[PDB]
Amino acid sequence: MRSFLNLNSIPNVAAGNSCSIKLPIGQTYEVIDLRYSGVTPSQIKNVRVELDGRLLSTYKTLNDLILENTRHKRKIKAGVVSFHFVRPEMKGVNVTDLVQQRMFALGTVGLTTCEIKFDIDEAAAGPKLSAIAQKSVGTAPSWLTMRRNFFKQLNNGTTEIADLPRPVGYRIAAIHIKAAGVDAVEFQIDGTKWRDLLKKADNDYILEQYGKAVLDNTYTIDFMLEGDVYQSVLLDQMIQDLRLKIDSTMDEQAEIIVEYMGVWSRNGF
Amino acid sequence: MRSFLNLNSIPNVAAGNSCSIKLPIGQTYEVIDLRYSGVTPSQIKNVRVELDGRLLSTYKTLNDLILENTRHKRKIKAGVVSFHFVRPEMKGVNVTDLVQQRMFALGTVGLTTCEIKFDIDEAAAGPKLSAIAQKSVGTAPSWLTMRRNFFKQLNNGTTEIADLPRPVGYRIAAIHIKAAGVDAVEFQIDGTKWRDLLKKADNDYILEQYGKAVLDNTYTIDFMLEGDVYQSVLLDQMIQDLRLKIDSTMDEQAEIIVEYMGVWSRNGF
Amino acid sequence: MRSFLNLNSIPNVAAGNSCSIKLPIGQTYEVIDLRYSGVTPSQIKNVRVELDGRLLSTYKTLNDLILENTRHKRKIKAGVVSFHFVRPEMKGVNVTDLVQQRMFALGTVGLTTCEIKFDIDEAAAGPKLSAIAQKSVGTAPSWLTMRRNFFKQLNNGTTEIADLPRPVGYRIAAIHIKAAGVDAVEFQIDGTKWRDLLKKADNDYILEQYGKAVLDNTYTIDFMLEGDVYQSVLLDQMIQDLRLKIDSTMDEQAEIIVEYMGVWSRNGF
Amino acid sequence: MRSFLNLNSIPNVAAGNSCSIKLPIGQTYEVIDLRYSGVTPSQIKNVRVELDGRLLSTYKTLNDLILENTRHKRKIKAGVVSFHFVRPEMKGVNVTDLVQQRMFALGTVGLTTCEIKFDIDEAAAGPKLSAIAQKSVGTAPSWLTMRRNFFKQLNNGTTEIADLPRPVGYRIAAIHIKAAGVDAVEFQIDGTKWRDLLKKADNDYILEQYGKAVLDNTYTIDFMLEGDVYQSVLLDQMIQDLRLKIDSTMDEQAEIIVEYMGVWSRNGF
Amino acid sequence: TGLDALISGWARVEQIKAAKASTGQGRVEQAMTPELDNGAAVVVEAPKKAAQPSETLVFGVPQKTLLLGFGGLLVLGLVMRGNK
Ligand SMILES: [Ca+2]
Ligand SMILES: [Ca+2]
């Protein structure tokens, strides 16, 4: 049996304020529903999920969490944005789908602090935020999704990005290139071309082919289209080159979103 | 291989008549498609599914079966209403999804009588009813869904309902509060608040979050949102209090729908 | 990890030409995305999937592949048509859904040639065709879907079709009767009526009930509505009669589509 | 002994058409003589040399190939333009001149496709194109010249270009800045000024000093003036900065031509 | 990998072509080469070398086999002492 709780009131919710959603340790957080009003998702900046003071996932703005959910075609409702720790799209290969999905839940056992920090923009009309938690029996943090942010310059022509962090033992579920002039992209590991120079229209067709929604000004490289976690990129301690070849038409700075995965460690990624 | 059969003609289908769909014993009924015309679903009153003369499920009107299917977002077609014994939304935890769904099928092995009784309203224009059966190999009644009806008065303020039947060994898949002025509800067992006083808007958001459709003038407490049967309420004998705290804005009589579950017994619930 | 490749250029793509998509042997083809322009799907005639020179699946026109995907409610996009070897609708009974779906993938190991032949109509404006392959680790052809074409005269009254090929050990996933005046159909094997004389409206209701889309001027007999492969017709060597009783209202020529299934053999069906 | 062959007829040569020169695999192509009439070199746009579908060299228009040959003072004839794969200006340091020149020949051994694609402008009077091949014994693609296109904006003052691709192990034979207002340029690698801020008149004098022809509105940085391949820029991995400092007098967009060199790879630049 | 060491290979590749060009038989060898769009490629990774596992096993079995030899030679040597 799960428990649906109305989280404690968020302290000091005001424009230009730096607030935090301190989660009580002991149980497992499958989903966290954040209700907002008097402020836009884009006005909720620097969203950071911290476990024991360390960064797990990061969102430039709350709007990126809305887009993250939209991509998987999850239920979107105005005035509310959810933190899906449990991945509903997961499919089991040697275990049940339920086990593969729940395996991403935010367990807090052994944790000292679990926080969701963020900054409220100064322009916020009259910010009002509350949270509800869908919890289950306590478990260690274990397998978690770690959304990381990276900024790189794209040229009009061909740009290559090979300096992406490769935490050993971790995996890569997907890579999202946020740019308005990306025509095609190619992904390779150690010379091996896992993703040919696929045109945007072709890449976007495959995405939609798997029930995903194409995000505006974004080139998504989904490594878990089938929902199989074993299809994701395994950051082998032996990989020599993890490269991305981007064919752009504009000269801009792209925001590269990398969805990492791995067993959370107090001294890990 | 499944068998699709055109059930025998329904005897004496006329306005103000009391008809019955007598099902032949021997096989398993996964789904029963009831075609209707010259009458409204609301004009088909007191629908009862009886096994060996004992009540299994009850519907005030056929419209409640339409709403039951609508809630799970099942295919709805005008002029037809199906009895989904097999639950398509079921997900397996230690077994396949298919096994978990088919486990709810209406097996008839060992049964003496299987009937679907109902009364045709007197105002019925020109009632016309036929049925089709989607069957499979015979099995005992076994695990079945037992829809029960309850009527309780609601105040304008807080109303508590703790006298709901607690058949030992059985489970509760969901509870539907049919009232027009319900603001928030709280569910607890032995003091433990499994469902905080959740506002309707918040409860309805979680429901939709799991692919469910919100029913008009209804507050649904789904204990199987994930499709996992083991998330449902286990009516354990040692349970001392099963309470419902309803915050209404109107003074009316609510129809409480309780979806029970358990292994069908000749001498059980 | 899967590999997305931009297949080699299709040789001699012109109106009235006979082209072929020669697939490199070694790996497994889960899906093949064919992009087209300057030509209609109906202008791409006689589509044949050949393994080692032998016919596997056949499509009168590329439009039949579009309808095949539409029926399962797969993502349809103008200018592109995919060859879904892996069946996304498959559900596992004693294995995971993923295993049951991937089991239909087009493995090429041990093959000498893998081709997708077709003829470009003479009326084609300015045909332009390219293909992308979603591949995975190599496997033998193994379990494959074998789409077969049959043409039979349908009378106004009752017609019976019992001369359908019954390759031993193979299965039948579905049968599609392409005619404009079919009222009802009945399916039986050895006298046993597995599908009663079901009216089109009733048959189409069951189809939609399982997330399928009803095709125009088509009577589909889906033997895998649940996604369970073991619900399909198993062509046992002992079967004496495999009959279809069609109740039509028109005198016309029907195109009977039969979706066979079985372990591919160089000297088999 | 070499073989001079009249290549097969070029398919569909017409205004606004997209044609291709498909080269038969097996031997080595030293030179390809393309005869044209009823169309201008500038009317033959987007010329691409592709090996196995991958881009090798690119020309905005056929006129750029004419200028490429003119620069080296190669025989230029109206109505014909040659593709010099073998570099006649090469001089051997530890091998004969002949070996150093022939080393650039287009070997096709191991290749699946060798193509020279291009688009015929719509304004083309009455395009007529044919090709002749000067071939020799087959060899792998091996060492090839890879002409790449880049577009960068220039200011009136100083413009710095440090984002030029630096494929590891590859070399740079020359860099051509196509702009009308370039006064002087400076080239440096890791702070080291290999080419001082040389005035156009001074740079052009050195070029002519080595038998080269100065191209209009172009600032050429020839790294192989002596014909010695080892004088070219070696794109060593440890290189941290490859910069170009352009002193312009106009605010325009320049077309930067970079002549790369390296052993052709299925998965390389 | 060494760029200059590769370039030498490409320079030395031209020398062996020149060896064929000098003789009439080199020209007749190239006569059978045609031009078509039909190729049979096979591009794949290949493993190299193996040390330790075969050794450890092929050191265990002969050492025991030798030890049995010494035991046989010892008993033959010891029996000759008994015959003194
Ligand atoms: Ca976890
Ligand atoms: Ca049952």
Ligand SMILES: [Ca+2]
């Ligand atoms: Ca297969």
Ligand SMILES: [Ca+2]
């Ligand atoms: Ca070469």
